[PDB]
Point group: C3
Chain length 87, copies 3
């Protein structure tokens, strides 16, 4: 019936949205891993530059991304909790 | 009952979609803040390294430092966040 | 006309979800371009610092590899492309 088409399309919407949620979780998890790597690399190279300049007035800048990565984790958790079970 | 149940499921889909919109906005805004901080730090350390090499060669070859410009990318992230903001669902029931 | 309203709302949900898919694709593509530039810049300046320290004696430098992460972002973007809704 047209109502059966309504039910089918509604199930399709739920299916597509849940798959898209999976994709977004992947994207944000990967962005967080990359941000961790970026923070660590910049801070290691800042420490290297500071050590070298100390050997021989140069101040190096350090990166702190903890709050941002925590926020990304919270967003991923919300995405996990936003899955849909049609009755 | 399929009728009222269908209406219930439609409201549930709208609710979940709007919550997910909130989560995505949070993620992209936080990514933008992190990119701003990364750009600023990399450029500060590039300036420090250039200062050291210039200070030294005038006290053997020039080392060229690379600068980071993420402004267009952060503008695009802001546009995506705005579109996500405008994509909320207001059902008619 | 509750059913016609139900169909109307269903089309609205699909329309909004697809528009949001477009926004997410834009965000992740731009984040990947930014990660490309960040990796390249950090590695270029790492090479510069290693060169300076090598010549000034003629410290361990750290290099960044984000390739797996960027490949993963591209996969997420592709799945987002494939998640579009064509209602009947
Ligand atoms: Cl529906």
């Amino acid at each position: 019936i047209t109502q059966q088409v309504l039910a089918e399309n509604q199930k399709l919407i739920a299916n597509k949205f849940n798959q898209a949620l999976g994709a977004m979780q992947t994207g944000f998890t990967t962005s967080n891993l990359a941000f961790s790597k970026v923070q660590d690399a910049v801070n290691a190279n800042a420490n290297a530059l500071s050590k070298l300049a100390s050997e021989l007035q140069i101040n190096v800048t350090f990166l702190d991304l903890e709050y941002e990565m925590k926020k990304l984790e919270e967003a991923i958790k919300k995405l996990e909790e936003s899955y849909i079970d049609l009755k």
